[PDB]
Amino acid sequence: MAHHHHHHVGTAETVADTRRLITKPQNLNDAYGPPSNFLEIDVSNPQTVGVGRGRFTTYEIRVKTNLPIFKLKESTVRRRYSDFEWLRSELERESKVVVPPLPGKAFLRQLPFRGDDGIFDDNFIEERKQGLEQFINKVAGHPLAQNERCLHMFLQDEIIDKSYTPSKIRHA
């Protein structure tokens, strides 16, 4: 039914034998360029989406690339700082990714408050934005990171799924 090893699609010439062939991990392939590729990500376009007690601001992650991992080459998602955090540590969990420290403990004791912490203020937001996009362009552009499934959820699909598969971008 769904799983079938018999096929006569199109012009049938070869039959459903085994012969040899085999399907083994042949490492990374070639398509656009080396695993470095060209890469340009921008976290920005904030949305303060949350509750009066616990309101958070989401960031839109914009990316253009010809990376063989990124799949869509160039797309945009939107998720919150808390997802960046777990993305950071996830890359540090089982890989030696160049993951840098998150932007914080800086502008907070630098700016006013007003919006509880000041997160409702458009100055602070971009102050975290600038560093968060700095952060991401590394963790989302480094060999080890392109090798961690964490990037698949961050740059691709729609959102970071906190129940995803803890493995590499390349799957068997």
CA within 13 Å, CB half, 2: 0
The answer to whether 80 is a known ligand-binding residue is yes
What's the rounded Cα separation, in Å, for the pair 19 and 104? 59
What's the rounded Cα separation, in Å, for the pair 84 and 86? 6
The answer to whether 82 is a known ligand-binding residue is yes
The answer to whether 20 is a known ligand-binding residue is no
**C-alpha to C-alpha distances, 45 to 48, 121, 128, nearest whole angstrom:** 10, 13, 12
The answer to whether 79 is a known ligand-binding residue is no
CB within 8 Å of 86: residues ≥ 6 apart: 160, 162
Burial of 74 (0-12, 13-18, 19+ CB in 10 A): middle
Known binding-site residue numbers: 80, 82, 105, 128
